[PDB]
């Protein structure tokens, strides 16, 4: 739903990389070259950002007010 | 037979199926061969059976 704070396996903070990683993919980087420009080497940490599906963007569409 | 099943096992009957000569030279106990009995029995038993 929202990017986990840490990689489940490793312990490494991946919570601050979802916006940076969606911005690099918007730029032109391929998805494997975005993941190490962010500094994610182990493939344990790399599936946090590849596999993440962001649902909170859909849950924010249901405004309580306005 | 009057026995419970937790204690019986699988054995083999030795006297079924050898043949009428292999049965004899295996279950017979000759007491005549003096040399062979000093191999099996001690000296003071080989006179008692001989």
């Amino acid at each position: 739903m929202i990017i986990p704070v840490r990689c489940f396996t490793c312990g490494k903070i991946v919570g601050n990389k979802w916006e940076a990683y969606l911005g690099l993919l918007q730029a032109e980087y391929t998805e494997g070259d975005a993941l190490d420009a962010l500094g994610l080497k182990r493939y344990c940490c790399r599936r946090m950002l590849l596999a993440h599906v962001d649902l909170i963007e859909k849950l924010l569409n249901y405004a309580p007010l306005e | 037979d009057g026995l419970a099943g937790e204690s019986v096992e699988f054995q083999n009957l030795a006297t079924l199926k050898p043949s009428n000569k292999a049965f004899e030279k295996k279950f017979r106990f000759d007491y005549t061969n003096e040399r062979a009995l000093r191999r099996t029995l001690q000296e003071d038993l080989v006179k008692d059976v001989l």
Binding site: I2, V5, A63 | -
Partner: protein
């Protein structure tokens, strides 16, 4: 019958990881340090969250959980605080805790990224890792939703909860060429070379070395931000040495009292 004289050699030291080599030690001592890096090294982490208003789309416990996993720079504090269960106080103290505070309301039209910039601490030195690179997203609020809470950070180690685990990943390794044949390859050439392999590209594994023990344990300790990667080590050595001294005191009491 006695001790061994280990020697250390740092090969790489950055502010995110240390690679060192320890020589002349037993495999048990070298692996037990590895476990002390992961569990028993104290660190500060949010552990008490009182939620005053939460109207985000996330839970109440989803916020508190994501707040415990935010790493806070413990570096000289963490050795001055006390454990919460040992403070002779009632309801947290500046001497056993650090108080945080998040107050966010989305009033604008765009969505709000509640990040860890919003967690305001009361000590200037225990802050989330923002000092000198984005910030750990906590929620995203919409127009009219909010979050006020106050939270408390106390001292602990990774044996209670993983949130108090100071490392990203510890890379222990010994004997890169299969010299001891501690592992037995069915086809030794399908195996890539270690990073540390003092072997040519011709041969596959080192020839078997019958009388020989492990030494030269290669480590690569990587921090998560909370402690500096050479303070994780200096603290695991002291934390282990202190488990042992305590065991020895309790032992001498058991011996003299029998």
């Amino acid at each position: 019958p006695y001790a061994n004289q280990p020697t250390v050699r740092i090969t790489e030291l950055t502010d995110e990881n240390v690679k060192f080599i320890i020589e002349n030690t037993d495999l048990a001592v070298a692996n037990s340090i590895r476990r002390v890096f992961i569990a028993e090294v104290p660190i500060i982490a949010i552990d008490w969250v009182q939620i005053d208003a939460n109207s985000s789309v996330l839970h109440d416990e989803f916020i508190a959980h994501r707040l415990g996993l935010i790493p806070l720079t413990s570096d000289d504090i963490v050795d001055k605080l006390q454990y919460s269960r040992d403070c002779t106080c009632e309801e947290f103290c500046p001497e056993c805790s650090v108080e945080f505070t998040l107050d966010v309301r989305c009033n604008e039209d765009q969505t709000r990224h509640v990040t860890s910039r919003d967690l305001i601490s009361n000590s200037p030195r225990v802050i989330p890792v923002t000092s000198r690179q984005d910030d750990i997203l906590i929620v995203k609020l919409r127009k009219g939703q909010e979050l006020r809470l106050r939270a408390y950070a106390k001292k602990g180690f990774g044996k209670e909860h993983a949130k108090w685990n100071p490392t990203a990943g510890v890379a222990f390794e010994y004997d890169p060429d299969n010299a001891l044949r501690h592992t037995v390859y069915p086809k030794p050439e399908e195996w890539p070379k270690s990073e540390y392999s003092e072997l040519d590209e011709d041969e596959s594994q080192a020839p078997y070395d019958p009388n020989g023990k492990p030494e030269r344990f290669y480590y690569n300790v990587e921090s998560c931000g909370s402690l500096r990667p050479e303070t994780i080590v200096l603290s695991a050595l002291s934390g282990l040495k202190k488990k042992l001294s305590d065991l020895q005191t309790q032992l001498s009491h058991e011996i003299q009292s029998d």
